[PDB]
C-alpha cells in the first residue's frame, strides 16, 4: 500500500509568436517519493483528459492535450518508494465556440491542479473517481471542482500522485 498525497508544478509559458504557429508542445517529469509505500505497489497513470482554458476575458482559448510519456503502470518492488513520471501536453487553439474548463480571468496566466495524476489505488477506486471526474466535466463543472473531488476520492486510502501545470501566454 501507498498512502501519500504528492504533487509538482510545472510552468507552461506559451510562445509570443503563438497566434503564427498555433501549436505548442512541452514535456515534464518529476521524481515522487512516497515513503509511505510498503509491500508491492502497482502506481496507474491515469488516462487525461484535454483541457480547454480561456484566457484575457475568455477572448483566447487554448485546447491542452495531454499524453503520458510512459503509459505503462509503475511497479514498486517491496518498499521501494520512488519512481519516476511524466508527460507532454500539447496547445493549439481551441474551437471559438468550446466552453472553457479553467479561465485565467482577465489575464493570461492561470493554475490548472491535476492536470495529470497516477494513483497506487484499486481499480474499483480508480475507475469510479475517473468517471465522476469525466461526468463532472461533461456536466459543465469546473475543472477545479472537478478535480478536487477526484483527487480528493483518489487519495482516501491511497495514494495520489498529480502533477500542476501553471499556464501563462503574454504576447
Ligand atoms: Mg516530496
Given at each position: 500500500?501507498?498512502?501519500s498525497e504528492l504533487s509538482?508544478?510545472?510552468n507552461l509559458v506559451v510562445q509570443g509568436d503563438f497566434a503564427l504557429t498555433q501549436?505548442?508542445?512541452?514535456?515534464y517529469e518529476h521524481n515522487f517519493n512516497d515513503s509511505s509505500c510498503v509491500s508491492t505497489n502497482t502506481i496507474t497513470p491515469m488516462s487525461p483528459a484535454d483541457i480547454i482554458v480561456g484566457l484575457y476575458?475568455?477572448?483566447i482559448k487554448l485546447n491542452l492535450?495531454?499524453?503520458w510519456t510512459?503509459?505503462?503502470?509503475i511497479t514498486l518492488s517491496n518498499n521501494q518508494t520512488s519512481f519516476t513520471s511524466g508527460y507532454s501536453v500539447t496547445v493549439t487553439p481551441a474551437a471559438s465556440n468550446a466552453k472553457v474548463n479553467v479561465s485565467a480571468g482577465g489575464g493570461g496566466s492561470v493554475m490548472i491542479n491535476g492536470?495529470?495524476?497516477?494513483s497506487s489505488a484499486s481499480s474499483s477506486t480508480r475507475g469510479s473517481?475517473?468517471?465522476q471526474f469525466l461526468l463532472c466535466l461533461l456536466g459543465g463543472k469546473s475543472w477545479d471542482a472537478c478535480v478536487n473531488s477526484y483527487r480528493n476520492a483518489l487519495a482516501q486510502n491511497a495514494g495520489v500522485y498529480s502533477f500542476n501545470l501553471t499556464l501563462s501566454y503574454n504576447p
Amino acid at each position: 500500500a501507498c498512502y501519500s498525497e504528492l504533487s509538482v508544478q510545472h510552468n507552461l509559458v506559451v510562445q509570443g509568436d503563438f497566434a503564427l504557429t498555433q501549436t505548442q508542445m512541452a514535456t515534464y517529469e518529476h521524481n515522487f517519493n512516497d515513503s509511505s509505500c510498503v509491500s508491492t505497489n502497482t502506481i496507474t497513470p491515469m488516462s487525461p483528459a484535454d483541457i480547454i482554458v480561456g484566457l484575457y476575458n475568455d477572448t483566447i482559448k487554448l485546447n491542452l492535450h495531454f499524453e503520458w510519456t510512459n503509459k505503462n503502470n509503475i511497479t514498486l518492488s517491496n518498499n521501494q518508494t520512488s519512481f519516476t513520471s511524466g508527460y507532454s501536453v500539447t496547445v493549439t487553439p481551441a474551437a471559438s465556440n468550446a466552453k472553457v474548463n479553467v479561465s485565467a480571468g482577465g489575464g493570461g496566466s492561470v493554475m490548472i491542479n491535476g492536470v495529470a495524476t497516477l494513483s497506487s489505488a484499486s481499480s474499483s477506486t480508480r475507475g469510479s473517481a475517473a468517471v465522476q471526474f469525466l461526468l463532472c466535466l461533461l456536466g459543465g463543472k469546473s475543472w477545479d471542482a472537478c478535480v478536487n473531488s477526484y483527487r480528493n476520492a483518489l487519495a482516501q486510502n491511497a495514494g495520489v500522485y498529480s502533477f500542476n501545470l501553471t499556464l501563462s501566454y503574454n504576447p
